[PDB]
Motif scaffolding. Structure first.
Motif, PDB file in Angstrom:
ATOM      1  N   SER A 122       0.774  -1.601   0.305  1.00 26.52           N
ATOM      2  CA  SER A 122      -0.280  -0.106  -0.146  1.00 26.52           C
ATOM      3  C   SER A 122       0.781   0.747  -0.328  1.00 26.52           C
ATOM      4  CB  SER A 122      -0.713   0.058   0.918  1.00 26.52           C
ATOM      5  N   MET A 123       1.415   1.278   0.935  1.00 27.88           N
ATOM      6  CA  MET A 123       2.485   1.862   0.591  1.00 27.88           C
ATOM      7  C   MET A 123       4.283   1.964  -0.093  1.00 27.88           C
ATOM      8  SD  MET A 123       4.137   5.034   4.214  1.00 27.88           S
ATOM      9  CE  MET A 123       5.965   4.582   4.672  1.00 27.88           C
TER      10      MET A 123
ATOM     11  N   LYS B 216       4.081   2.656 -12.287  1.00 30.29           N
ATOM     12  CA  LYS B 216       5.024   3.642 -11.083  1.00 30.29           C
ATOM     13  C   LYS B 216       6.144   1.927 -10.998  1.00 30.29           C
ATOM     14  CE  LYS B 216       1.689   3.625  -8.572  1.00 30.29           C
ATOM     15  NZ  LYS B 216       0.891   2.985  -9.882  1.00 30.29           N
TER      16      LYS B 216
HETATM   17  C1  LIG Z   1       2.981   6.197  -2.590  1.00 31.84           C
HETATM   18  O1  LIG Z   1       2.015   5.907  -1.254  1.00 31.84           O
HETATM   19  C2  LIG Z   1       1.381   6.722  -1.099  1.00 31.84           C
HETATM   20  C3  LIG Z   1       0.520   7.033   0.351  1.00 31.84           C
HETATM   21  O2  LIG Z   1       0.191   7.664   0.570  1.00 31.84           O
HETATM   22  C4  LIG Z   1       0.648   6.819  -2.967  1.00 31.84           C
HETATM   23  O3  LIG Z   1      -0.563   8.636  -1.816  1.00 31.84           O
HETATM   24  C5  LIG Z   1       1.057   7.518  -3.709  1.00 31.84           C
HETATM   25  O4  LIG Z   1       0.404   7.374  -5.087  1.00 31.84           O
HETATM   26  C6  LIG Z   1       2.163   6.509  -3.591  1.00 31.84           C
HETATM   27  N1  LIG Z   1       2.802   6.353  -4.841  1.00 31.84           N
HETATM   28  C7  LIG Z   1       2.647   6.146  -6.378  1.00 31.84           C
HETATM   29  C8  LIG Z   1       3.726   6.634  -7.403  1.00 31.84           C
HETATM   30  O5  LIG Z   1       1.422   6.130  -6.868  1.00 31.84           O
END
Ligand SMILES: *[C@@H]1O[C@H](CO)[C@@H](O)[C@H](O)[C@H]1NC(C)=O
Ligand SMILES: *[C@@H]1O[C@H](CO)[C@@H](O[C@@H]2O[C@H](CO)[C@@H](O[C@H]3O[C@H](CO[C@H]4O[C@H](CO[C@H]5O[C@H](CO)[C@@H](O)[C@H](O)[C@@H]5O)[C@@H](O)[C@H](O[C@H]5O[C@H](CO)[C@@H](O)[C@H](O)[C@@H]5O)[C@@H]4O)[C@@H](O[C@H]4O[C@H](CO)[C@@H](O)[C@H](O)[C@@H]4O)[C@H](O)[C@@H]3O)[C@H](O)[C@H]2NC(C)=O)[C@H](O)[C@H]1NC(C)=O
Ligand SMILES: *[C@@H]1O[C@H](CO)[C@@H](O)[C@H](O)[C@H]1NC(C)=O
Ligand SMILES: *[C@@H]1O[C@H](CO)[C@@H](O)[C@H](O)[C@H]1NC(C)=O
Ligand SMILES: *[C@@H]1O[C@H](CO)[C@@H](O)[C@H](O)[C@H]1NC(C)=O
Ligand SMILES: *[C@@H]1O[C@H](CO)[C@@H](O)[C@H](O)[C@H]1NC(C)=O
Ligand SMILES: *[C@@H]1O[C@H](CO)[C@@H](O)[C@H](O)[C@H]1NC(C)=O
Lengths: 436, 266, 231, 438, 232, 266
Positions: free
Chosen positions: A37-38, A70
């Motif tokens: 998720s992170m 990503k």
């Molecule tokens: C990285 O994780 C965060 C979690 O809050 C998210 O909002 C963000 O979109 C993520 N990065 C990408 C490139 O999606």
């Protein structure tokens, strides 16, 4: 906050390595997705290489692609390989071979090995690039060295190749692999006679004492492990002489298929079994996807199995109007690797106009290249039928009759249909002679 | 029999479903039939359609060539078929010729002719004591006797040519039975001629009994010569037959019932 | 899905202008790229058609007849070994097939047959191995009579296909009807004329641009390039 | 008429060659070699060398050295590559011919130039271990690569039939997972076979006699696995030596290049004469079990240099004279010492201790027992070192270092506890008595 | 006879005069040599004497202490690891024998023994590994007392033998008596001195004259020389 | 004792032949003693020799510390020996200690010692009914009572710290028989002290001897209850011994010879 991301992934890594249960695997995958998720890259690729494939998570092709963007934005080495495969095989996204090639080459530059496999094969059998010796050879070397180092330590896990429709190129040298084969077959003859307790006569088998035959078959499996392992070291070493300069002279075209017979065995070919298993309990969306990676990778088993799955139109990712062209593609790829049934299936695909237009000439030459090289009685009789009705080429009889004749002696089980065919051929001939 | 037409309708329905079952799985002509060749529930069914079909074929020919069974030769056919069907089944496993569905149709011709040969023997003894025989009975029998002669002559010509070109195989013993099958068709030919000359004259013939006894001695001698030759050719090559001893004893009895009867009579 | 169209990635630097001739390179089709070692890149692909025949095929050379004329005079022919028969092909004299019957000890029987003797803006193109490839046809007959054509001498056409690794050998043997055959010969000289050359698809070139602050080409396959040059 | 004699010779030789290849019988071999003798009567060279390598080695003919040399001189004048090799072997080992190393070297170099392989292996080892010539990487590397290439191009086709290196003075980085899976499979098979229904003492009585049905194909499976595994192992050794010699991956190394080309060549196909010499050692014919071992010792085997030194040790060979039998065993003990054999160094020390061959020299034997001790941890070297320390043989007498040597002899092996016990008891008894006398 | 005397094959060609210096050549010890390609050679052999020491040993260099004083003053010395102990010899300052005892967590105990401290026309020669080589010793005593000889300080000798590719290492360590030791040094320097050099036996050369009608180099040897130079 | 020297001299010439046979193959010291160790026949004669030496040693021991046998205890020496010598081999054939020339002695010294503890107690029961015993008899058997008492105890102390500093092994059983040999001297400890007051008093002592037997019965029960707590440890670890049940069986017999005897006296 990054500290809690890796710690949750450690629990999933412990549960996955420590437990092979389905619920434990599902819980470890849920924890891995929670770590993903992170944007934790290691868990992100670990949940990616199961979420798109299936049999661990519900399949979500679009989420896999949207997070592959990503993953390739960061520069992940296994992020390039699978997204290049996605662009290649036309999976939920418009297909383009050039983008697939660049993503595959950058994955091969990330230090990945499935990308190196795919680049060696696509260099080898001329797919999307010119046929070439050198770069196919070095891409297969960069995988066979790692596969050899792995099988020298871990013992080289044996995987059964199952088909779903089930120079020095004669044997690529001789000797050591042959002796491994007769050692294997004499141990096979040793174990089978040992189970035989038909001469028990109140004894011998010890009244359902299964505790002998169980470790019989496990000793057999472990002997199979040792024999295939030694076989693969033998093939790798003959290939390493054949490649550089020694023993036999410089010989590209009988080294890259010996390297390829090591890389194929390897450890990547465990997805064959978990694709076959996914086929045996419904879930036709999961085998056609795990087989496509092993088909683009270069297997002849998986190119056939993926074509056979696509042949009966159960694959749900692809459009129903585009199922046959991809099946035709994988049949054509399996034909070039010397599989017999692929050539006749290509012939039938050109015969009934499956995916392409109906054109009998290419069908006839496909049936012939199945005929004189692999000695398949099926293509003999099918091209005799092609003769006797006069499709494609001129009409006559005696070419069909001899073709039915060598269709008869070519296989023992071809006795009946050649008889019913030359029966109807003689009936037609006698009716025409009476009309004459 | 309506039940005979019932099991034959059920027989074609059984083979009708397996092929359609085979056609659904494998869509082309060639691979749908080889499945029937190898797989055990498919192949075990298809020949016992062929067994009842050749039973129906033998029956429908028998009504054309014979007006009605006398209900006395039905039992004679019943045991004589029952011994021979075991003799043919034992010969197929002793020779180690394996299960090939192209030779199973070959000895089914042999037992079909041998059954119809015994029907000629059980029709010519009745013709000896038949005082009211029409010209249709004579014509339908002399057509059967002529037809069996050529087909026996055609099959040995295939056999003795096969024994010279190919070599010693299962075709050798089949032509020897066909040569024995020539022997029992030669007996009726003399018996029909000696009884046709009996019916055309309104007086008994004393020389007819001597001619029938002398010819049975002749055919008795050629029957035991063919049996003693088949023993000698089968011990040198291949293996022990252990068959054709049941009708050897009947041929030995026929030699005893002819030579010793003529010795006591003359 | 068009397997036999090639591709090749190259690294021409920072400053580069897209070529106009050949294929067309567009701008929306670019892709942002990076390797594991944090190097940003931009790869542009052209449209993969490779259509038409605008190769400026100009050939002042003569007809395809004189190129094979040296094969007539030399009379040095190869053979072919098949399952039972042995198809001997000689160019300019006749074609011959025979099968040796080796009797035990003293004599050899021969079964010698005879294929035949030799005493347009759209070029013809035939299908071998599934690919479309041009050919030059020749016609001759007057061979041995065949009884299944009721004493008609046979005729056959001899096929020309170029291969740089060929030595006037036979690829395959075929027949279209009874006592009428077709023999495929691989000769290395005739492809030098452009229209008879093997139809190889032009390579479609994809160029990857190096954004500055990064090497012109990724740092990984540098050592991989040094890795093959030492093996 | 001379051409007709040549025509009959090849006609005579071909029958013998066919009989030899078609029959393994000893009488058949003797008849084929009698045909070969009659072929050699008219100076047929292929028969000349085929009977020359049995008249001298004593394996298919009655051994006769002098005829073998008398035809070896003709074979060398003509220019054979299989006649200069064995004449070099004769001039090297002093076998029925006066000894000289220079004639052996020139014969071996020309036998290498003739394209022979035994002479290539011999010159490779003699350049490797510095015998007769200067020690070097390059010459041993060349003459070992030229044999390793041939033996791999022979084994990659024919598979290279196995042979086991049996020792007369003893009996009379690739491949971990395969090995561990193989012994694991073996132990699972053996516990399964010993589970059975008591496969030994069954209900018995008069025995069921149903048949074991398991042993022969089990031994066949093991044997073909042995042949397959040794094939793969020396395949891997060839590739490792090539990659250490050319420079790819790992730079040019000399030492592990020749030590792998050497192991590759040694495991070759002329190691069946190991078995031929051992089998000629049983049945009591030492005169031909030391000549088929002297050649394999010149080639550079450590099994042969020890077996031929053990055979020369106990005075059984009757060809070499009684006044030259121990130096010709000292030489092979010395050669089998530098190749890392424990017993060879100990027996070299024994030879310098008892004055066998050479003069008696305790101080020289001291170094040999020391080298047998510290290099390879051999118990008997520790014990004999203690014995020399105990009564001052070659050095000053001392008790405490002798005791140190006896205790680490006791720790070195689980076999040596008893004699070190009665040595330490005798040492303490002599020390106590001497202190009492003082 | 033995395995010490080295031979080297030479191919000078047709014309060759036998050298009168070094080894002796006599004309009966000849062999006539034919190869496989019918090329005739005449190979002469040397007499196997390799005797005397008339190598004209005249050296005007310094004393052996000159080649050792820099090794003393460099103050960078070698180590050696044993199965239990660790012998550290330091040239010109002392030799140290010790073993580290690693207690579980806090303590490290050292068992230290001190081997000493420094506050002729025939060179004596020591038999190492069965070969005779001439050395230079260093006499030394006053080590720590040894309880075996009623607290007599230890004594030791330091042994010097050259080896042209060396890093001042120790080949072997020996104890002749109790608490009296012997250590050796392989240094690349001191056999600039005339006598402590490795006595290489002279190479008795073998020449093979080429008879007329034959080349000076055999054909199979000719292509064997290019293969390994390319493969080098 | 002419026959005794005959058995020794013939055996010495037998071990003199084996050590001469081994010397002729391997001429040196260390390989000779090694070859005698490994080869099964040379080990058995040395096994046979050492049993002869201890046989003479036991009789010489039996000569010095025992003036004359009463001709009623040698069978009591015999049966308790083949109880103990069967005990040691059964534990050895259980523990998989294997044939090694370092522990085969230890069982035989265990068989050696255990007999003389039996020879101690039979000599003290004869002492209970001996009316003429000199001071040389009394003052010399107490030395044997004390000396082999401590030598067993110190060897037990050698063993029980060997088992503690290594782990559970075959030395666990060794001290356990040493423990009941430890009680064996404490058996003749109390019996000498109670004998000491009977000889000096010219009058029977009723409750004194009853308390003497009561004390010896007490500790003899406690000694076996430790020994049953010895054996019962060995079910959880290693394997079922299937031995030492025979002097389990007598152990509770001694308890029932103690509990019921005390109940009848009380
Ligand atoms: C990285 O994780 C965060 C979690 O809050 C998210 O909002 C963000 O979109 C993520 N990065 C990408 C490139 O999606
Ligand atoms: C694999 O590797 C393992 C290493 O991890 C090996 O482990 C062994 O471990 C045991 C531990 O129990 C070691 O045993 C003994 O080790 C120490 C040190 O003893 C050694 O040093 C003695 C020094 O005495 C001499 O020193 C000077 C040397 O220059 C002399 O000048 C001097 O005069 C003196 O003679 C040495 O003598 C001894 O050898 C034997 O010598 C004595 C006397 O003759 C004999 O009686 C003995 O039998 C002894 O074996 C050893 O080499 C020792 O501890 C010392 O220090 C503590 C400090 O508190 C004292 O309490 C203690 O009393 C003693 O003084 C212990 O006695 C210990 O038992 C063994 O050495 C290790 N082995 C090796 C090879 O290192 C393992 O064996 C290896 N496995 C193999 C090789 O298979
Ligand atoms: C793929 O590209 C085609 C044409 O370029 C376009 O029509 C289609 O919408 C695209 N699909 C996706 C998923 O981007
Ligand atoms: C597949 O795509 C084309 C587009 O028209 C056509 O063949 C067909 O309409 C599509 N298939 C279906 C099932 O609509
Ligand atoms: C060579 O053959 C001839 C012909 O008989 C013979 O005289 C001669 O002795 C042979 N050579 C040798 C060296 O024996
Ligand atoms: C061989 O050497 C011995 C030793 O002196 C000598 O007597 C003999 O003549 C020599 N033989 C030859 C052929 O040189
Ligand atoms: C070996 O030397 C001895 C020493 O004199 C001498 O008898 C002879 O040369 C040789 N011995 C024999 C037995 O020939």
């Amino acid at each position: 906050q990054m500290q809690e991301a890796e710690m949750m992934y450690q629990t999933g890594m412990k549960i996955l390595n420590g437990s092979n249960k389905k619920s434990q695997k599902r819980e470890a995958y849920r924890y891995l997705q929670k770590a993903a998720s992170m944007n934790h890259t290691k868990a992100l690729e670990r949940v990616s290489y199961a979420l798109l494939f299936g049999d661990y998570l519900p399949q979500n092709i679009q989420a896999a692609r949207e997070m592959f963007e990503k993953l390739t934005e960061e520069g992940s080495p296994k992020g390039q390989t699978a997204l290049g495969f996605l662009y290649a095989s036309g999976l939920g996204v418009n297909s383009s071979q050039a983008k697939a090639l660049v993503y595959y080459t950058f994955g091969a530059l990330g230090g990945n090995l499935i990308a190196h496999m795919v680049l060696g094969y696509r260099y080898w059998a001329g797919i999307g690039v010119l046929q070439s010796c050198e770069s196919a050879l070095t891409h297969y070397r960069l995988v066979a060295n790692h596969v050899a180092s792995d099988i020298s330590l871990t013992g080289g896990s044996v995987v059964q190749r199952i088909r779903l429709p089930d120079g020095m190129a004669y044997l690529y040298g001789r000797g050591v692999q042959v002796n491994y084969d007769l050692a294997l077959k004499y141990f096979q003859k040793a174990a089978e006679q040992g189970w035989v307790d038909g001469q028990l006569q109140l004894g011998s088998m010890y009244y359902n004492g299964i505790g002998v035959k169980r470790d019989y078959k496990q000793a057999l499996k472990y002997f199979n492990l040792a024999s295939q392992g030694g076989h693969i070291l033998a093939f790798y070493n003959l290939a390493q002489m054949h490649a550089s300069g020694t023993g036999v002279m410089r010989s590209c075209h009988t080294a890259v298929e010996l390297f390829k017979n090591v890389c194929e065995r390897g450890r990547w070919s465990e997805r064959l079994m978990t694709a076959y298993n996914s086929y045996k309990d419904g879930d036709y969306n999961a085998a056609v996807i795990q087989y496509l990676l092993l088909a683009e990778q270069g297997y002849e088993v998986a190119q056939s199995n993926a074509a056979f799955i696509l042949d009966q139109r159960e694959a749900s990712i692809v459009g129903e109007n585009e199922t046959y062209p991809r099946a035709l593609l994988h049949w054509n790829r399996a034909a070039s690797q010397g599989y017999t049934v692929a050539r006749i299936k290509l012939g039938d695909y050109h015969f009934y106009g499956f995916g392409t237009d109906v054109d009998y000439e290419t069908a006839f030459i496909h049936y012939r290249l199945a005929s004189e090289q692999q000695h398949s009685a099926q293509a003999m009789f099918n091209l005799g039928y092609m003769h006797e009705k006069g499709l494609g080429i001129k009409q006559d009889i005696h070419l069909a009759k001899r073709f039915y004749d060598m269709a008869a002696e070519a296989s023992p089980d071809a006795q009946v249909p050649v008889f019913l065919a030359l029966c109807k051929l003689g009936v037609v001939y006698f009716l025409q002679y009476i009309r004459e | 029999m309506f039940r005979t037409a019932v099991m034959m309708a059920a027989s074609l329905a059984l083979t009708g479903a397996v092929v359609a079952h085979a056609y659904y799985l494998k869509h082309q002509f060639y691979p749908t039939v080889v499945y029937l060749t190898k797989s055990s529930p498919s192949m075990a069914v298809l020949y016992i359609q062929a067994f009842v079909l050749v039973f129906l074929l033998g029956k429908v020919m028998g009504k054309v060539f014979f007006g009605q069974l006398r209900a006395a030769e039905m039992e004679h056919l019943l045991e004589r078929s029952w011994y021979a069907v075991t003799e043919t089944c034992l010969a197929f496993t002793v020779f180690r010729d394996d299960f090939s569905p192209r030779f199973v149709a070959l000895f089914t011709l042999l037992l079909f002719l041998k059954c119809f040969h015994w029907l000629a023997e059980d029709r010519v003894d009745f013709m000896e004591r038949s005082p009211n025989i029409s010209w249709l009975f004579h014509c339908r029998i002399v057509s059967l006797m002529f037809l069996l002669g050529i087909l026996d002559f055609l099959f040995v010509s295939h056999a003795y040519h096969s024994i010279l070109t190919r070599g010693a195989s299962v075709q050798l013993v089949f032509g020897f039975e066909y040569a024995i099958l020539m022997t029992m068709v030669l007996t009726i030919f003399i018996k029909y001629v000696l009884h046709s000359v009996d019916l055309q004259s309104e007086n008994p013939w004393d020389n007819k009994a001597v001619y029938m006894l002398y010819t049975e001695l002749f055919t008795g001698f050629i029957k035991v010569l063919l049996y003693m030759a088949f023993m000698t050719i089968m011990i040198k090559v291949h293996t022990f037959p252990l068959f054709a001893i049941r009708p050897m004893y009947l041929a030995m009895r026929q030699f005893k019932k002819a030579v010793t009867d003529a010795i006591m009579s003359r | 899905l068009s397997d036999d169209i090639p591709f090749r990635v190259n690294w021409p630097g920072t400053e580069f202008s897209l070529p106009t001739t050949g294929v067309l390179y567009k701008e929306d089709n670019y892709v942002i790229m990076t390797t594991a070692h944090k190097e940003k890149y931009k790869c542009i692909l052209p449209l993969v058609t490779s259509g038409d025949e605008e190769e400026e095929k100009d050939y002042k050379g003569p007809n395809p007849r004189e190129l094979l004329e040296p094969l007539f005079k030399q009379s040095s022919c190869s053979y072919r070994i098949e399952s039972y028969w042995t198809y001997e092909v000689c160019h300019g004299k006749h074609i011959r097939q025979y099968h040796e019957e080796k009797e035990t000890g003293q004599k050899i029987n021969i079964h010698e047959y005879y294929l035949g003797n030799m005493l347009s803006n759209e070029i013809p193109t035939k299908n071998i191995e599934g690919q479309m490839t041009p050919y030059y046809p020749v016609g001759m007959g007057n061979g041995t009579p065949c009884s299944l054509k009721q004493n008609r001498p046979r005729s056959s056409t001899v096929m020309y296909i170029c291969h740089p690794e060929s030595k006037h050998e036979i690829l395959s043997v075929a027949e279209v009807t009874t006592c009428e055959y077709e023999v495929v010969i691989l000769t290395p000289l005739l492809c030098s004329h452009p229209k008879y050359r093997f139809r190889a698809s032009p390579v479609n070139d994809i160029f990857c641009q190096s954004l500055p602050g990064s090497p012109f080409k990724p740092l990984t396959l540098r050592q991989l390039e040094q890795q093959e040059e030492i093996l």
